[PDB]
Design a binder for this molecule. Structure first.
Ligand SMILES: CC(=O)N[C@@H]1[C@@H](O)[C@H](O[C@@H]2O[C@H](CO)[C@@H](O[C@@H]3O[C@H](CO)[C@@H](O)[C@H](O)[C@H]3NC(C)=O)[C@H](O)[C@H]2NC(C)=O)[C@@H](CO)O[C@H]1O
Ligand SMILES: [Cl-]
Ligand SMILES: [Cl-]
Ligand code: NA
Length: 129
């Protein structure tokens, strides 16, 4: 599924991401825009052999099992394919674990480089929330 901006904002709000660990909703919508262009099916392979999955591009070396990232952990206890679903529940639940892990949203390179320190509330302007 390719979400609309406000559609995704509303879905993320319902799943408790607004102000989760202090990150306003706009941060999460911004991170999803630049990680995946709002496409739940996005995948990208990294040089270390791990793969990033889904709307928040969650990485298979630490967070999910895809059967081909040797010596990886599965800290979210889920197959990486669960993260590609049109239902964002699995991605959100896993992201909550990632963002609690100490480095905050800096775990998302696109958030660090393209969202951090910007006017992120712009990502939710015009949305009925
Ligand atoms: C969205 C996504 O999948 N992002 C990936 C990043 O998570 C990943 O960076 C490394 O991720 C983990 C968690 O953010 C870090 O491990 C933790 O680091 C803290 C701080 O040092 C430490 O206190 C924790 O105990 C430790 N926990 C565990 C379980 O390991 C790790 O430090 C991150 N970065 C580095 C440079 O090590 C990167 C790199 O694989 O990929 C993203 O896609
Ligand atoms: Cl907000
Ligand atoms: Cl933080
Ligand atoms: Na993993």
């Amino acid at each position: 599924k390719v979400f609309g901006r406000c559609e995704l904002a509303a879905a993320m709000k319902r799943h408790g991401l607004d102000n989760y660990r202090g990150y306003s909703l706009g941060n999460w919508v911004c991170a999803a825009k630049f990680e995946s262009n709002f496409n739940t099916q996005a995948t990208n392979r990294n040089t270390d052999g791990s793969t990033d999955y889904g709307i928040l591009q969650i990485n298979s070396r630490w967070w999910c099992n895809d059967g081909r990232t040797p010596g990886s952990r599965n800290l979210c206890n889920i197959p990486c394919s669960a993260l590609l679903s049109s239902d964002i529940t699995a991605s959100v639940n896993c992201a909550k674990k990632i963002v609690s892990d100490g480095n905050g949203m800096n775990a998302w390179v696109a958030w660090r480089n393209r969202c951090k320190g910007t006017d992120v509330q712009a990502w939710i302007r015009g949305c009925r929330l």
